[PDB]
From a paper:
The Sso7c4 protein possesses a homodimeric DNA-binding fold that forms a swapped β-loop-β ‘Yin-Yang’ topology, and it belongs to the SpoVT-AbrB superfamily. The dimeric Sso7c4 protein, which consists of eight intertwined β sheets and two flanking α helices, forms a dimer via intermolecular associations between β1 and β3′ (the primes indicate the second monomer in the dimer) and β1′ and β3 in the flank, β2 and β2′ at the top, and β4 and β4′ at the bottom. In our study, Sso7c4 exhibits DNA-binding activity and alters the trajectory of the DNA through bending and bridging.
We also determined the crystal structure of C-terminally truncated Sso7c4 at a resolution of 1.4 Å to address the potential effect of the flexible C-terminus on DNA binding. In contrast to the wild-type structure, there are three homodimers in one asymmetric unit of the C-terminally truncated Sso7c4 crystal, which is in the P31 space group. The crystal structures of the wild-type and C-terminally truncated proteins are similar, as indicated by the good superposition of their α carbons (the r.m.s.d. value is 0.35 Å for 85 atoms). In the crystal structure of the C-terminal truncation mutant, the R11 side chains of the three molecules in one asymmetric unit are all exposed to solvent and flexible, consistent with the results of previous NMR dynamics studies. The FP results showed that all the C-terminally truncated proteins exhibited lower binding affinity to 8-bp, 10-bp, and 20-bp DNAs than the wild-type protein. In contrast, the C-terminally truncated protein bound to the 10-bp and 20-bp DNAs with similar affinities (~11 μM) but bound to the 8-bp DNA with slightly weaker affinity. At higher protein:DNA ratios (1:0.5 dimer:bp), a considerable number of C-terminally truncated Sso7c4-DNA complexes were observed to form a more open circular shape (67%, n = 109), suggesting that the C-terminally truncated proteins induced DNA stiffening. However, the DNA contour length was not reduced upon C-terminally truncated Sso7c4 binding (1834.97 nm for 5 bp/dimer and 1830.06 nm for 0.5 bp/dimer), implying that both C-termini of Sso7c4 are also involved in bending DNA. The FRET data confirm the EM observation showing that the C-terminally truncated protein forms a rigid filament along DNA. In conclusion, wild-type Sso7c4 induces the formation of a more compact DNA structure primarily through both bridging and bending interactions, whereas C-terminally truncated proteins rigidify and open the DNA molecules at high protein concentrations.
Author numbering:
A (entry chain F): 3 to 48
B (entry chain E): 2 to 47
C (entry chain B), D (entry chain A), E (entry chain C), F (entry chain D): 2 to 48
């Protein structure tokens, strides 16, 4: 479950609908955004 | 860790905050890949 | 040394950590030679 | 030698092939150490 | 600047790191010109 | 000039050739700074 997205103004990233089936975020929700040094990726967690 | 709390915007977007972008150097308009990692139960942005 | 403990993934796949890849620069589709070194008891990965 | 050619997988993973695994017995979930060997300029995987 | 520290490898080789290659796109097998700039006292690599 | 054409090696390595090394006296294990110089469009390698 992988999709390419374009980063929006003010560095916003859509979480695509196919990803959200597994990660069900809603307007208003708090998420933790982390840089993972081990893999060199950003992680988003609920 | 380099972590921040972000509130999910309208239309299911997540801002990548400045502190995170110091290590993950995306620019407005960039393409990125958004994946659900099942093992860890997080979204990865790569 | 630049190294990390990693958990093996499905289908016997091993993630090469980002700090290791700074020195050993691989991308999907690259050919590598994977060898078992008996003397050292390790697997070696070469480009 | 026990060697095989492997194509790097998505997300910077390398498959450990069956011929290599006859000598280096790993599977999904196992812990391994992945290192960059500076002297040889290769990646090594150790149990 | 786009700069990185590299340790000279065996046989007098220098890795061109990924951040530098975003600007200087070289591939294995490519011809490049290595020059000593006598006045600045540095090496320069050109395509 | 002291210049020579070389072929890029695996893992994006460049050999610093012998005629260059007579002037830029590097050795396995030395640290060097590798920079992309935009003005000149070259990679610089400095001790």
């Amino acid at each position: 479950v992988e999709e390419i997205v374009k980063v929006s103004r003010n560095y916003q990233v859509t979480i695509p609908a196919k990803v959200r089936q597994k990660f069900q975020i809603k307007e208003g929700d708090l998420v933790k955004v982390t840089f993972d040094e081990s893999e060199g990726v950003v992680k988003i967690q609920l």
